[PDB]
Curated annotation (Swiss-Prot):
Annotated active site: 544 (charge relay system), 631 (charge relay system), 670 (charge relay system)
Signal peptide start-end: none
Protein name: Prolyl endopeptidase
Annotated InterPro entries: AB_hydrolase_fold, Pept_S9_AS, Pept_S9A_N, Peptidase_S9_cat, Peptidase_S9A, Prolyl_oligopep/macrocyclase
Reactions catalysed according to its record: Hydrolysis of Pro-|-Xaa >> Ala-|-Xaa in oligopeptides
Keywords annotated in UniProt: Acetylation, Cytoplasm, Hydrolase, Protease, Serine protease
Species assigned in the record: Sus scrofa (Pig)
GO molecular-function terms, A-Z: serine-type endopeptidase activity
Amino acid sequence: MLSFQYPDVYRDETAIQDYHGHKVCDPYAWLEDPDSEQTKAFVEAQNKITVPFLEQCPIRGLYKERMTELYDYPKYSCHFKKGKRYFYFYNTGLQNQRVLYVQDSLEGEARVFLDPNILSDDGTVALRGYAFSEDGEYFAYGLSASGSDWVTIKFMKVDGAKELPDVLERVKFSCMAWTHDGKGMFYNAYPTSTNLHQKLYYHVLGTDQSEDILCAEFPDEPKWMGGAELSDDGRYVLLSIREGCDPVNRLWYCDLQQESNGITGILKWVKLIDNFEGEYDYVTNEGTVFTFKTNRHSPNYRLINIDFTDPEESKWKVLVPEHEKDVLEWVACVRSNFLVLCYLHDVKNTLQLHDLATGALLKIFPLEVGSVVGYSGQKKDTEIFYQFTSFLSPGIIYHCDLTKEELEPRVFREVTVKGIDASDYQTVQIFYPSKDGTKIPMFIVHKKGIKLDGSHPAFLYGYGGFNISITPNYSVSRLIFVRHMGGVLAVANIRGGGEYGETWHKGGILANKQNCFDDFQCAAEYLIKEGYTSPKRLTINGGSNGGLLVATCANQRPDLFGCVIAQVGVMDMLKFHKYTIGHAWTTDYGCSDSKQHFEWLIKYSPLHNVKLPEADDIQYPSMLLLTADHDDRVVPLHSLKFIATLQYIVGRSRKQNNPLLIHVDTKAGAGAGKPTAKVIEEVSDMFAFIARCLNIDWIP
């Protein structure tokens, strides 16, 4: 049972806004301020009920012990070469943050180069971006505290790992790009609030930030963000300008040879692509001929060559045409004249080597079914590394020496499932019909030989937005659910994602956002119909835009789910654009300032669709929201107002017996750069909640 009471929470019944003639009340609006005494008291009252609930069953401790043991495996990035040295990231297993190492050769002794763990007591200072100078002798790196999106950039001389005096503040959503003369580096800085007016600066090494040169600004377009990179030959600065989250950008360039006295003020920008109709992602150039990955006229992406000296679109060359189905995910240039292309084929990666001059296929790098999650090999490099992972594969790093006549990729590092036997499980891919008949991919992972009798707990994950493809990845936390809780794992590749290119994305955004929710509800119906699980035993989970997914699903089909866990969810679809970087998400969601968009948003906004189920035998699933009390990406008011609303409307009802809880982390932030210790706490909360709500016996 629930041996607690929900806290009394003040309702500001005067908080009424007219939206295009539709009056909307927001009685918990005051939870927008994370530092008020009122919001702090609300947070404290909620945690006072949630924490004892989660910690009461010995299950949480059993899970936490197993997680701590099974997550304690070596974690490596690919090696990458910079100048005359190799670097890689490595975590012995349970360090809060991974450490950057340096070695003089592949064969050589490695030494610690940058250890973020020494920057805090609790691993809450994290590396957030870095850039080596072109010659590899200098290193810039960003640090973020408590998951904040604000960054401080610091600098080191690589030889002897010497700290330099240079410090850059007010950095956020920033490029880091050194000019090839080694003189300095481009970065971005700013002059619940929304930051606007991001500018591009150039920092000369050995000077104060107050001396930095302003190189680009967009004072008539406060939402524009301009990121700089250097061409591979150092001649051009390429400025990619974004506004919102769609895969599109303007592309301007500056020929640095044409800057008379070097970088001294606003650069002589040539506005090569001066609209937001397509994405142009620089791959490499040979003189004035620039190869870009684009989605212009090509929703599954392709490679084009634009000659800056003859730049009309009718003159562009298609180097690697668009595939009819497979998405070109990313492209690198290596060993001067090779291209590495990574495709997504039915939600699994393939990796290929092509000739730069013709686009011809040269070599397929064989992979098992899963994802390529890391890669190294730049134009001047003569070898590649790439890292593969999958639901049952922690990671394999491959290496290939590209100077050889016959290429022979080899295993360079491999980590196997520790503790659990991977051969006892299997991963299947199925395609299920959505409401409108569209076939949606879903991966299912389960113990071999189970009976499809509906008896198994299931954990169904989704995201559904922003052109993000949800590809196979290794999660110890989910494998513990399978092995020790007898669960079935599922990941549904719903629309809004990038799995089938830009048409898949467009099929799940704006007026079509309800297609995401339909797809995800249909995934749940498939797992049930096919006998993997039953509604009372089904948990759904998502984070951020995926927290919106699962919150909406709880309101729309409370009868389909036993348990819902939403991490840092976007819950107030009418006000999201008003806070921090939320304005950028209007490219997926629309904005309530428009009547048309309001009419879409109101139908699904989780905060505005909490309703007691009409049927006497249906209640809301058990729900757990997780957020920290400060989060500059998804402001916590989303989850705070949502849980207040759930507890008032549904939790007060006699028929509601399933708990509706929030756990607010008040300890030095969660979010991106989350230390290992927090990850372990969070998954332990999640799976304890599931275990208690579904009364699942631990399987030792």
